[PDB]
Design a binder for these strands. Sequence first.
DNA 1: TGGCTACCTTAA
DNA 2: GAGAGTCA
DNA 3: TGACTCTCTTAA
DNA 4: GGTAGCCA
Lengths: 162, 162
Amino acid sequence: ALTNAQILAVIDSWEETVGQFPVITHHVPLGGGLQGTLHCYEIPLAAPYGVGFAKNGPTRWQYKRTINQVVHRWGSHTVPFLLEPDNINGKTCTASHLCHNTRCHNPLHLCWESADDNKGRNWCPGPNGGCVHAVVCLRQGPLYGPGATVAGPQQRGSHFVV
Amino acid sequence: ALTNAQILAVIDSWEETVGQFPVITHHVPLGGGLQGTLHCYEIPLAAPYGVGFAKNGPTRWQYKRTINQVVHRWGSHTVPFLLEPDNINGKTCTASHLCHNTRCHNPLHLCWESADDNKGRNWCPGPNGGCVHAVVCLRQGPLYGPGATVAGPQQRGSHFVV
DNA sequence: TGGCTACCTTAA
DNA sequence: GAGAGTCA
DNA sequence: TGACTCTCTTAA
DNA sequence: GGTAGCCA
Ligand SMILES: [Mg+2]
Ligand SMILES: [Mg+2]
Ligand SMILES: [Zn+2]
Ligand SMILES: [Zn+2]
Ligand SMILES: [Zn+2]
Ligand SMILES: [Zn+2]
């Protein structure tokens, strides 16, 4: 349907509108006991959010553009990867926040990857903690840590071995 | 209701019946390019599963014991931790497989931790890969890796910075 | 018990 | 992390 | 376009 | 990953 040139047109209008979202400076742990700085372009909390942006859910938004009399809509974060495929190895791709900030829409803090790879980053040590992600992390997962496990493995008798 | 003495009674009857489940020897990656061995006590695929065991779902089971004329039922993997609390920092605890094998019921391959901690193990490098979990992992997550991310962060214009 | 049933909560 | 709809 | 509304997906 | 019902 849409032409490559028309797509690009969209992406570009996107980047502009997004470009004017307020910029927020965030200190994030990169790992290795090192701290870094990031800048998220966060969509407003309430309307108006932007030109062509709407909220379909609490932390959900959609971008909509009319072209040759037909309305087109996509996920507020799916645009930068409109030219990229929509499945890798049979796995549907989505937009993953590398900053772990939903409201943020900076494409530099985003990526196209499966739902599993996306979640994984949640527990990643960080680029400085030892991240091994093909597309490196810009920050250490917000869940990385030793955890708060209550009870470990244990048997009362001796009916088992490891 | 149930007394501590009564509880232990359960756990023991559990460990007993569980102890006779067929034992399966599995080779698993511990990380660091190292391989180890584990022994899972897998519940049968179909009935009969065991003494007081039933299937409430494809990969779901329940243990049931009658005591002083009142039936008691729990999750086939929750028993080992019946004396332990049911929430840490306000987070409900569950049973996490350290071997990542549902059918397995070996308490040496189990632990009581939040739902998030449980999931995190999924991407853990392993005890030999660099695991930092308070309650060490028995194997490296089955999802650990660089991933198959299709597109990385990128902007067409120059409206952004990291 | 034995053996099924149907329904539930998650963050992205 | 997604889809679609419906008033204006 | 503006601004609201709805249901879905996933394996733990 | 987890709670409960029904019928022999
Ligand atoms: Mg993410
Ligand atoms: Mg698990
Ligand atoms: Zn950001
Ligand atoms: Zn990473
Ligand atoms: Zn096991
Ligand atoms: Zn671990």
